[PDB]
Structure formats: C-alpha cells, structure tokens
C-alpha cells in the first residue's frame, strides 16, 4: 500500500513551492524532508504521499488526558505510517515510537538580534532587561523544564511565570519577534534552524554561544512496524554516500542569502 | 547472570589506573567508557565484569572468511553481552549487531605536528612532500576506502598504494608517528580522539579544518539481546540528564594538560 508520511511545515524542511496552486500530489513541496523522503522511498523501495501533520504539532503527551498529539501521535493512532521531520529523539518518545538512528545533530541554541549584549545561556540567566522563550510544545520547551541544571533550571523558573508569554506558536513567530524586539527579546531554538535564519534576509539575527545539548533527528515509525528496520540502514546508507551533508549544503548554504 | 562488557584500550574512553597492579576486577580501570559502563549498569540493574577485547580490534569483516573481529566478533559469536567502548555505528555492523542511539556525536579529522602547512584534506591531496594515513580494521579507513568524492578518493589511491604503510595498528601509534615526523606525517582519527590529544603534553599537535564527516559512537548487542531495549533507553535517559556532558568534560578537559 501508499505509506502515508506525516511531516510538518518548516522551513527549509517542507515549504509548500510558489505555484503549489498548480501542481497535484507529492509535488506540491520542496525542501530537506521532502528531498529525503524521496531517496528513502526510493531505497526502501515504497510509493508514498506527503500530508502536512493536521494540529501543527511535533509531539506531545497531554499528562492527565494522555492523549498524544502532533507528528508523534499520528503514528501512535495509525493514522500515518512514518514521520520524516526534523523529529527530536527522546526518551519519551522512544517509548512509544520507533527511531531511526539520527540523520542530523544538533542542539539547542541562542537566537540574537544582531548587536544584543548576550553571549551564554548564563548571561540570559543573570539579567531580565532582555527577555526570552522557546517554541511550545516541543523538545526544547520540555529540555528546560526537565533541566536539573542550575543556569537552566533558573532560566525556566523565569520562562515558566513570564507576563505576557514568552513562548511561541512557531519557529516563525519566534523569529519574527526576535526581529521586531529592538534587542529585548532573545530566542532558544534548534541550531540547526538557527545556522539557517542567519543566512536569510534581512541577515539581522545572529546564532551566539555553544549549544546547550547534543541530540539529534531521527525518522520515526509506529512500533512493531515493518518498515522500521529497512529505514534506519538506508539513514545510515545515506549518511555514509555523503547523501545528508549534500542535502544540508543544497537547502542551507547553496541557497544563502547574506 | 553477570553481564560480560567487551571494551577496548583506548584513552581516554578506557584507561588502565596508575595503580592497576594492586587492584582486580573492573577496578582495574578508569575512564569515559568506564564511568558510562557503572551508569548503565545501575539504572538497568545489573552486574558486569568489564574485559579487555582479545585482538585488541574493534571489529571488521574478514573479506575471504566472512568471519567478524575485534568487538563486534565477540558480540557476533556469543562471547560478550554487550560493548562500550568509542564503537562507530556503521551500516555494515548494524547488519550483524544492534546498536543504542549515539552517546557520542563526531567526524574524522586531520591531527598535524604544529607549525606543519596543512589546514584541509584537499591541502593533503594536493601534495606528496607530507605524508599521512589512518588507523586499521576501523571505520575511518573503511570511510576512505569507499568514497566517491573527489579529494577522499585521491586521498585513498595515495594510502592504498602507499611505500611504507601509512596506515597504524593503535591510536598511540598514530598520534606517535605524528610527533616524531618533522611534520611530514598527518594523521586521519575521529575528532573526539584528536581533541583529547591536543590537550595532552608535549601539547605538540593540533586538529585542523573541519570534520571531513558526521557519525556518532553508540552502544552495541547482540541482536536479540535482552539488554538492547534497556540499554538504548538508558543512553538517552543519560544524555538527557546531562551525564554525557558531565563525563566528557572530566576525561578531556578536566584533566587538560596544555
Ligand atoms: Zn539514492
Ligand atoms: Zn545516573
Ligand atoms: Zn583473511
């Protein structure tokens, strides 16, 4: 059968093409995800189609409903068959879907309007004039309420109580508030995300400091499934034919704009 | 059962202490590896015995026997439960073995006396005045070996046909070859080792250029191993923790000497 592939709207990852009006099918998007979901197919051997993960969600459990949802629970509730995003293994989720070994590293990092006085998670942690907040929903969110470190922990006990919110809906939302903070707002987000706003117009932004963790993104499936194994060796065929590190140049670099 | 762990002698990851003589069993040893072995263990509540590889290999395919080496070989026929040690997760092996999700993430790199003319792996294949090789039955060499890009595949003819042997039995004996060379001697080794080196005296090396590619080093069973499910969830739970951060600090870092 067409294996259904859950994936989420992110750029570079999946962006829907200028004239998606006048195409049909699989063709309607371009980016990272849908150049590899192409080439595991191909290499596994299996027809798909691409669908946009309905609630706009990574994945998440809700504590006391217990409901998942996001790209996570849609494999969870079969309603797709694999998962190709930029999908944060972690525990939690381990232990309800399957992971194919990481296709990219990465970790959480700082987002800067270009010229603010910050340079480490510790310096975010010892002021307040420059406020800041992470996606919602995600990994990242749940990396600093889970954090028993103290510059972390401090940073999501301020975070957690901060008026108006200082968490976002989207990578898009937090970007553009970065951009419109004067200075006064400074974003945690995936490094990899970051490396790629650098290199967009209006080139104000500015990735600073270390990552905060190592982790990386893996292809997700629903557990026991048959496609699980054939996926993760064809990750690791194409980690190791250069395959990812091209995709990465062709979608961050090649395509830069500063 | 007392879990056997197959590991390897490889600093800092697994470490004879100064004071080896007067002491048995695992307290023998010191190190990352070893550190991460006592965490798994007592989250997964079991006991081991920690034993040195036979042929001191990490483990390679015999190309006319078909029979498997080094750590991989004892896992393959029965002779351990389980390996810790920097074991690179590789297609070929995820074939024969199970592997946890990484516990460390790295690339080869290029080690250099200090002061030698060398900043790229193109800088090497352009010239015959310095010399340089990798490690044996690894995934370094088997990197070169394989690959179809231009500057590693005229980087490969040079090592293959190369009068003496560029290639090293150990690590020790790379990074050796290096220091007594007059500079006319670059070494190819994971960057996880080559950092490590840079920060031991006579502090006469140094990593150069980027990593020429991206793997990661993870946990190895037996496939259809009890422990395989466990073990991957407890590298996780770990990395989460920031343990993982912890112990790479300590063994390279920590007790930098330059
Ligand atoms: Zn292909
Ligand atoms: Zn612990
Ligand atoms: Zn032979």
Request: hydrophobic share 35%; glycine share 8%.
């Amino acid at each position: 059968k067409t294996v259904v592939v859950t994936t989420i709207l992110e750029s570079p990852y999946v962006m829907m093409k200028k004239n998606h009006e006048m195409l049909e099918g699989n063709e309607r998007y371009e980016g990272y995800c849908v150049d590899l979901a192409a080439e595991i197919a191909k290499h596994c051997g299996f027809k798909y189609k691409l669908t946009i993960v309905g609630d706009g969600k990574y994945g998440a459990r809700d504590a006391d409903t217990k409901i998942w949802n996001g790209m996570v629970g849609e494999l969870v509730y079969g309603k797709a068959d694999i998962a190709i995003a930029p999908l944060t293994i972690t525990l939690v989720r381990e232990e309800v879907i399957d992971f194919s070994k990481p296709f990219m590293s990465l970790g959480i990092s700082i987002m800067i309007k270009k010229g603010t006085p910050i340079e480490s998670a510790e310096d975010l942690s010892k002021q307040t004039e420059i406020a800041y907040g992470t996606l919602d929903s995600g990994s990242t969110k749940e990396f600093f309420r889970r954090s028993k470190i103290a510059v972390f922990d401090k940073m999501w006990t301020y975070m957690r109580s901060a008026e108006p919110s200082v968490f976002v809906r989207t990578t898009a939302e937090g970007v553009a508030r970065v951009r419109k903070s004067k200075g006064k707002y400074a974003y945690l987000l995936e490094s990899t995300m970051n490396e790629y706003i650098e290199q967009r117009k209006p080139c104000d932004t500015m990735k600073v400091g270390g990552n905060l963790d190592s982790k990386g993104y893996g292809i997700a499936t629903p557990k026991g499934s048959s496609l699980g194994n054939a996926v993760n060796l064809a990750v690791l065929k194409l980690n190791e034919q250069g395959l990812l590190d091209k995709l990465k140049n062709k979608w961050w670099y090649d395509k830069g704009e500063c």
